[PDB]
Enzyme design. Structure first.
Site, PDB file in Angstrom:
ATOM      1  N   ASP D  38       0.505  -1.311   0.102  1.00  0.00           N
ATOM      2  CA  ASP D  38       0.423  -0.049  -0.160  1.00  0.00           C
ATOM      3  C   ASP D  38       0.803   1.094  -0.266  1.00  0.00           C
ATOM      4  OD1 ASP D  38       0.286  -1.003   2.449  1.00  0.00           O
ATOM      5  OD2 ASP D  38      -0.289   0.566   3.803  1.00  0.00           O
ATOM      6  N   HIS D 243      24.791   1.169 -16.725  1.00  0.00           N
ATOM      7  CA  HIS D 243      24.176   1.526 -16.772  1.00  0.00           C
ATOM      8  C   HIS D 243      24.072   1.042 -15.265  1.00  0.00           C
ATOM      9  CE1 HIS D 243      19.506  -0.375 -15.204  1.00  0.00           C
ATOM     10  NE2 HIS D 243      19.560   0.797 -14.192  1.00  0.00           N
ATOM     11  N   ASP D 260      27.570   9.373 -13.301  1.00  0.00           N
ATOM     12  CA  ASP D 260      26.543  10.536 -13.713  1.00  0.00           C
ATOM     13  C   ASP D 260      24.681  10.518 -12.576  1.00  0.00           C
ATOM     14  OD1 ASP D 260      24.684  10.782 -15.600  1.00  0.00           O
ATOM     15  OD2 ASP D 260      24.642   9.250 -17.085  1.00  0.00           O
ATOM     16  N   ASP D 271      21.639  16.320 -16.621  1.00  0.00           N
ATOM     17  CA  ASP D 271      22.460  15.661 -16.065  1.00  0.00           C
ATOM     18  C   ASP D 271      23.829  15.594 -17.004  1.00  0.00           C
ATOM     19  OD1 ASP D 271      23.016  12.885 -17.321  1.00  0.00           O
ATOM     20  OD2 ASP D 271      21.859  12.986 -19.414  1.00  0.00           O
ATOM     21  N   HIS D 350      27.985   4.143 -27.721  1.00  0.00           N
ATOM     22  CA  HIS D 350      26.398   4.747 -27.070  1.00  0.00           C
ATOM     23  C   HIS D 350      26.841   6.067 -27.496  1.00  0.00           C
ATOM     24  CE1 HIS D 350      28.514   7.816 -24.342  1.00  0.00           C
ATOM     25  NE2 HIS D 350      28.853   6.705 -23.309  1.00  0.00           N
ATOM     26  N   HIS D 354      21.366  13.798 -26.626  1.00  0.00           N
ATOM     27  CA  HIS D 354      20.146  13.550 -26.764  1.00  0.00           C
ATOM     28  C   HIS D 354      20.006  14.621 -26.056  1.00  0.00           C
ATOM     29  CE1 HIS D 354      20.098  13.404 -22.473  1.00  0.00           C
ATOM     30  NE2 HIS D 354      20.864  12.079 -21.836  1.00  0.00           N
ATOM     31  N   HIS D 361      16.235  12.550 -21.372  1.00  0.00           N
ATOM     32  CA  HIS D 361      16.199  11.739 -22.444  1.00  0.00           C
ATOM     33  C   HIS D 361      14.939  12.444 -23.624  1.00  0.00           C
ATOM     34  CE1 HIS D 361      18.318   7.554 -21.744  1.00  0.00           C
ATOM     35  NE2 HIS D 361      19.392   9.020 -21.849  1.00  0.00           N
ATOM     36  N   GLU D 383      28.364  13.790 -24.390  1.00  0.00           N
ATOM     37  CA  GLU D 383      29.006  12.588 -23.404  1.00  0.00           C
ATOM     38  C   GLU D 383      29.632  11.792 -24.086  1.00  0.00           C
ATOM     39  OE1 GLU D 383      25.480  10.500 -21.849  1.00  0.00           O
ATOM     40  OE2 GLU D 383      24.249  12.562 -22.425  1.00  0.00           O
ATOM     41  N   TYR D 387      35.243   3.017 -22.603  1.00  0.00           N
ATOM     42  CA  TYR D 387      35.057   2.140 -22.395  1.00  0.00           C
ATOM     43  C   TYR D 387      35.945   0.538 -22.269  1.00  0.00           C
ATOM     44  CZ  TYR D 387      30.874   5.378 -21.434  1.00  0.00           C
ATOM     45  OH  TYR D 387      30.600   6.380 -21.536  1.00  0.00           O
ATOM     46  N   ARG D 404      33.485   8.780 -19.581  1.00  0.00           N
ATOM     47  CA  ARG D 404      33.277   9.572 -19.566  1.00  0.00           C
ATOM     48  C   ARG D 404      32.598  10.683 -19.498  1.00  0.00           C
ATOM     49  NH1 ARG D 404      28.412   6.623 -18.931  1.00  0.00           N
ATOM     50  NH2 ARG D 404      27.293   7.411 -17.456  1.00  0.00           N
ATOM     51  N   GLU D 406      30.676  14.124 -18.680  1.00  0.00           N
ATOM     52  CA  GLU D 406      29.512  14.301 -20.149  1.00  0.00           C
ATOM     53  C   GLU D 406      28.986  16.073 -19.260  1.00  0.00           C
ATOM     54  OE1 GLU D 406      25.383  12.489 -18.946  1.00  0.00           O
ATOM     55  OE2 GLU D 406      24.597  12.994 -20.776  1.00  0.00           O
TER      56      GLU D 406
HETATM   57 MN   LIG Z   1      24.145  11.034 -18.210  1.00  0.00          MN
HETATM   58 MN   LIG Z   2      23.108  11.945 -21.348  1.00  0.00          MN
END
Ligand SMILES: [Mn+2]
Ligand SMILES: [Mn+2]
Ligand SMILES: [Mn+2]
Ligand SMILES: [Mn+2]
Ligand SMILES: [Mn+2]
Ligand SMILES: [Mn+2]
Ligand SMILES: [Mn+2]
Ligand SMILES: [Mn+2]
Lengths: 440, 440, 440, 440
Positions: D38, D243, D260, D271, D350, D354, D361, D383, D387, D404, D406
């Site tokens: 709940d 991810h 990130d 971002d 990648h 974006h 996104h 970004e 890797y 990375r 960004e």
């Molecule tokens: Mn990001």
């Molecule tokens: Mn991004």
């Protein structure tokens, strides 16, 4: 013949007898079905719902509540009497008359089912419901159970156990009572008369649907308003197609016509198949195939009795068919070897028998490969057949011949009773029947 | 009479003509429908799908793609030819023959629709789809559109505009072509012959369903295999119930019997109602009510023409009915005053006319209160009626009388053509007809 | 403190112990949930699924199969290891490591569940499934059962009995094991430290969300990444709103601030509420209301022990509150009389206690009106409170005061253990804590 | 910075401006979402609904009705003010205050939507609806349209055209207004400060989630209560997983940590990604990989301006990366040939950019391969990243490095504005920042 009030009552008690104490069984009526736009098909009640009520209305639910081994009652949900919607959409039983008419303890308006069902299930340990039968029914049941699960603050509890009653009910339907056998016997008689009429009316030049017309009219005049399944009238090459319901071709002199049709009388189905020459005279080739099929049927009718099985009898029929096909040159080789490799399947690709009852292909467990031992009370069909494709690599004169002969029987203590023997199947009797009809 | 290949082609082009460039219209076939367990009702194709194809198979979709004002093509999705399963599910058209047979540019297996439809819609601006018509169709369409929306990385785009084509197609079906009128004319003749036969065969003691049997057999022998709606045979008090399909009572000497039945010929519906004396002789009371209904019909048949409307003609019928009811003492008061009061409704509670076509209650906009101006090509019924309940507080002798007389007409340049006048309705002609038939 | 792999194995066996022989229990993982467009909320495993696995992945199903009283095994369905795609989504356990990691006998790819589940259920008599918990789960289960029901020709049979395992599993979760108590004890400490920090950081001018920030940071530094429910920080009039999660107002000098927040540690929830003055000093009016609430909590903490109930203790609290309110003039009349009419409800409208565990409002039967007798192992909250609306017709000074004090306790052999007493609640101790906080 | 009432009004009119006359647009709020049992996740309004209202409640629908090119009005459906359900589930706007607060012409109770919506759509030619966005919304819309289609007798008509407004609305969201740029600028600052803090707090031994905690606390203290997406903190080998949200490992001395994270401020997302050495010092190998990524980012930041595209700039970055990787020996061969065969993909898999806005996104058409020409007002991320898997066949010292960097930029008339440059990225500056943090 009729199913009495006493019998419907008896069936409910037989179900309740098998239910655990502190439970309820819910049996829903079939939904109305659209034919096109706003017009519907003639209503057909759900067989299981019908089995326990004989009530022919949609939006109705039978609720059998078992408190303990000596206390149980029934509640029916059905459409309310609307002296406005009735003048417009037929009469309805209503709540007042239902108790006495259907023999139920109480009747409530179907429009109140969502406000009442959960109250009936509240506190029970088990609910018997045929989940997946109807979407509208699952919505109603799930909705009630959800209401109970989430109502602990209102002291509501949902039964944690849900049991599908179909296996139990179908095992019940598998064994016909004397009353049911009487009704099925009448359905067989009515169906037989229709087939007899078809043979007498047949003439080259008529269309397949014309015989369909004769058959349906005959069903109707005896009180069997609707067929138990779509009538099949396949002449010539159409006879080689098991699912031939187009019945659109003109019947030709020299061709055979296969007719599979059965009426629905008081909910029960008749299921007869007869194949005969459109011109009333079997040719040598047609007669040769016919005899094999007839031998198969007569032998099966002699074998079927308590103790044997559809699988066992099927074995005998396969031997008969393979032997016959070898003699005619349709199959070549050793009989026993051909049998061992099922060389008959290209010509006989369906089962020999299926249960019969409230549904033409009735409910009930067959056992692996239909090996279940037969007992008195079971009703089944016997329908051997041979279909030789127009392009089959066999002696030319047999190509395009489709023949099936089917009767309905009930297993008895000493054997079986043929419910459809009143329509001829011996080739000589068929030709004589047609000849007599033709001199008028 | 039948619909030519050229006509189906003409209809598709008439729809394409109204579609925006860069669009596709999707028309789905009706789903097969369960009667009970594993048996299905005889298949009835979706009227709109039928209108554009004359194709009688389920699992088929017609896709009309319009590139621009001069370029367009068609794609049909339909069941694949299974020369090893058609033996169990009847013959199928298949992809190879479809193009030539149905006149479509390309044909694909229905089993591939989910892998092909989105490719056909990709990049279009508009998709014409009857959302909500069929659940299985919405699943397919929504699935395709979703695939396109989420496929930007694959350079896919979904049409943002979805238009319901039913309003456009139904406006098309509202105006019958010469070919359709010829088919409806034949449906009317067939239906008329059935009604004539029912009057000739009727005898006290017979059951209502017996006349139903006579009617269906007549439909069938003329090639109209199925009725366009469930046959109504209500004698005595049953005639006061508009939706009386039980047809279970024994017809008694002295009672009237109301028969509403129509055949379905080449997809089109006949819809005739005739009421007559079970014993072949109208009593005085019955004849008095009958004359009011007959005048209503006869007058309507004279009034209907281009320029008037169902609402307008209905007004004339209401006057006729109120006047007649006042003269017999069924209604009491000033005519105009009673009319203003709709004092007729308790006895005439339904509409005077409804469109007729691929559906008995055909598609098409009626306009507020059915006030739309009639034009040549429209096909409608004319069915006035009077129903006096058994418990109506009116002169005793009129209680329990239910009468309706209905014909099907097509509006012409100068008036209308009665398609069902071949079956008598004049009371003397009815009694005479029943006399000539009883000499045999 | 944590849950050992031995305990998870123990819980599974405890469930199997209660299952009938020849059955299977299906426990589904929670679905991932969308926050916005393509982004998801941090995954939260289904409490029941977690209880038996401690596995934090979606698309996973635990299947416990009990053959007989001594034989049973387990099958896990979970996402496959996508070595060349996990680079994108996330490390996954996979099938190879699962058996040893989760202690299950076998592991299969979730992508194969529809091809494997029915094979696991085939032939069983009972299936334990939480119907209605998740749509995706019901689809999978119903699909498997349907496949079995319709596969008699493949010798497949479906279990006719379906039992909801939630009642059984929730009764299990109601009684915490020593390991669980240790984890909840830690959750209580962490939550307490966060509340202590909030009181020490509070200053007029700060926004309510600022305290929320302090709290979440404290949860996190101790390894309790997420709150067990949305944090409540209501100062001034916002404290009178029970579900105040906006936490958007600037905290004014002179107002009280009510903070209800709890961490989620290893799946278990902490649930603490502390109310204190924003300026570090209770005003006379505030102190007077506070004492009544504190007395209620203190008495309850004294009373809770095996043998009593939430209902019983609640009765004591009601008397304390009514007495106190009468003394302050908030309520007028005879104490017992006021109690008899629940004159306290306008100021104390919620329950005194709720179970606590894997869910802040934990599972488990409370009994009518929460009268179930308490036993050792049960974990519950104690949260009396008084809320005086800004427009309540009572002595002006009390208007707009919202106070609640909540602790988490576990019932023991001789009473109860307070898991959150490490954060002060005595008004003097609160004020002392706050002035000393500043001293730095 | 915040979005003014005037701007919300402005956006609505901009949508109405593009709607056909005689239409209505329906925009539904997001449904509340369950976290466990709940308890619900903190509510997140639907981005499109938010875009036009800034209203943060569920069970609300905005209806924009356009009569003609000069007349249009608005109707809002939202929860009713309930003094009880509010004290229990938070304050609600209600119908009385809504008109003034949200700037809509009329407000009705959401509980009455099924009785009111169809009346609003009755007679319109077009309905703009995002079909498939939410199931509960499709139910409401389809229900209303069905009611209209079936209500010709009540003079109701349904709009035959349904247009998805998402393409139009998303094209609007793609171009930020001055107000939105100001809010996004603030989101970038807040996010930058959080990243700065993470670098300053990082120390070997700390866990990845500890930095997550620092970041979220920083977001919060500035009024950005929730992250725009799940925070990523991957040190060592975890940095090679795009991810990676587990953030469960202890950060080792000698490893890099990739962070990130972005806040959600007034609905808009920040971002940012920054990678740095856990021990405040880049190693030989780490610095070499870092420089390539930094060069890529800095070059992209130079290049991005009106007239170019993400695809074009990506081409430059690919060259930079391939060249760099060849020099380090990670790639072997001719630069151009390697580029021609995308030999960079194993290390940079990648996209480079974006869109950014109400969703991290963000919505908006990218064009094939993201080739759409950039214009002022578009907001996007930059970004680049490299890797190198722990098992990559490359010089051993580079294995296990994930980097990375960004930033978020807005295209301007002459180039672009970097919204996140307030957090360092040059290696020297990073090391210096971390040094000035270990001050004694
Ligand atoms: Mn990001
Ligand atoms: Mn991004
Ligand atoms: Mn048969
Ligand atoms: Mn049969
Ligand atoms: Mn009619
Ligand atoms: Mn009619
Ligand atoms: Mn709490
Ligand atoms: Mn609590």
């Amino acid at each position: 013949s009729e199913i009495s009030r006493q019998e419907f009552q008896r069936r409910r008690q037989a179900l309740v007898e098998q239910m655990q104490p502190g439970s309820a069984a819910l049996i829903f009526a079939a939904p109305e079905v659209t034919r096109s736009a706003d017009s519907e098909y003639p209503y057909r009640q759900n067989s299981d719902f019908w089995y326990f009520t004989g009530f022919n209305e949609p939006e109705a639910v039978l609720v059998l509540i078992k408190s303990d081994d000596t206390h149980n009652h029934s509640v029916l949900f059905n459409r309310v009497r609307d002296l406005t919607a009735e003048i417009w959409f037929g009469r309805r039983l209503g709540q007042d008359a239902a108790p006495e008419k259907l023999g139920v303890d109480r009747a409530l308006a179907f429009s109140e089912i969502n406000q009442q069902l959960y109250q009936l299930l509240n506190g029970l340990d088990v609910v018997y419901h045929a989940q997946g039968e109807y979407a509208y029914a699952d919505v109603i049941v799930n909705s009630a159970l959800e209401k109970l699960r989430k109502g602990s603050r209102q002291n509501l509890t949902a039964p944690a156990t849900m049991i599908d009653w179909r296996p139990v009910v179908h095992e019940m339907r598998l064994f016909k009572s004397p009353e049911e056998i009487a009704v099925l016997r009448r359905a067989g008689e009515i169906t037989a008369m229709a087939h007899t009429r078809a043979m007498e009316k047949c003439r080259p030049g008529m269309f397949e649907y014309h015989l369909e017309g004769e058959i349906h009219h005959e069903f109707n005049r005896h009180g069997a308003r609707y067929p138990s399944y779509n009538t099949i009238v396949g002449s010539g090459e159409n006879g080689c197609i098991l699912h031939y319901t187009e019945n659109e071709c003109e019947m030709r002199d020299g061709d055979l016509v296969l007719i599979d049709a059965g009426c629905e009388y008081k909910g029960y189905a008749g299921d007869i198949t007869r194949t005969f020459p459109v011109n009333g005279k079997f040719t040598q080739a047609q007669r040769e195939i016919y005899d094999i099929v007839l031998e198969s049927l007569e032998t099966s009718l002699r074998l079927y009795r308590p103790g044997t099985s559809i699988l066992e009898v099927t074995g005998e029929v396969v031997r008969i068919m393979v032997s016959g096909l070898v003699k005619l040159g349709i199959l070549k080789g050793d009989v026993d070897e051909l049998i061992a490799q099922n060389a008959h399947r290209p010509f006989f690709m369906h089962g020999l028998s299926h249960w019969l009852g409230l549904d033409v292909h009735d409910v009930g467990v067959y056992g692996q490969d239909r090996s279940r031992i037969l007992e008195p009370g079971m009703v089944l069909t016997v329908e051997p057949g041979l279909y030789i494709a127009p392009d089959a690599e066999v002696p030319e004169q047999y190509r395009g011949i489709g023949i099936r002969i089917e009767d309905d029987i009930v297993i008895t203590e000493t054997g079986n009773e043929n419910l459809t023997a009143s329509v001829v199947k011996k080739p000589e009797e068929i030709e004589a029947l047609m000849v007599a009809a033709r001199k008028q």
